[PDB]
Amino acid sequence: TVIDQILNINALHTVLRSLKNSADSLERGLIHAFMQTLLRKSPPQFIV
């Protein structure tokens, strides 16, 4: 029909797009948590 097709297609694209955005945020969370761990580990240069 009319409008229902396009609301269906946009709902499918909303689900797929939000999954892609969440996967990107998991990758950047890996970046940030690894950087967090390095900053917890590293003593400063004058001490070393």
């Binding site: 409008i3 396009i6 609301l7 297609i9 946009n10 694209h13």
Partner: protein, 66 residues
């Protein structure tokens, strides 16, 4: 239905359109009054003529048998 597929275009990503809300007002065909259809036109005899301004009509006189 590619005539109807204006929406979401020709690109898999970065270009899809939707709508939040909608709105509708139409406009009507107004009512219908033709002269010879309406019943006032019985009282009138209507003569088509080309130039009432250009020739002058008076003394329309009627000859009556009694």
């Amino acid at each position: 239905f590619d005539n109807l597929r204006i929406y979401f275009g020709d690109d898999p990503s970065r270009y899809n359109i939707s709508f939040e809300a909608l709105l509708g007002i139409y406009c009507n065909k107004i009512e219908w009054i033709n002269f010879f259809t309406t019943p006032i036109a019985v009282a009138a005899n209507v003569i088509r003529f080309n130039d009432v301004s250009r020739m002058t009509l008076g003394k329309v006189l009627f000859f009556i048998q009694l």
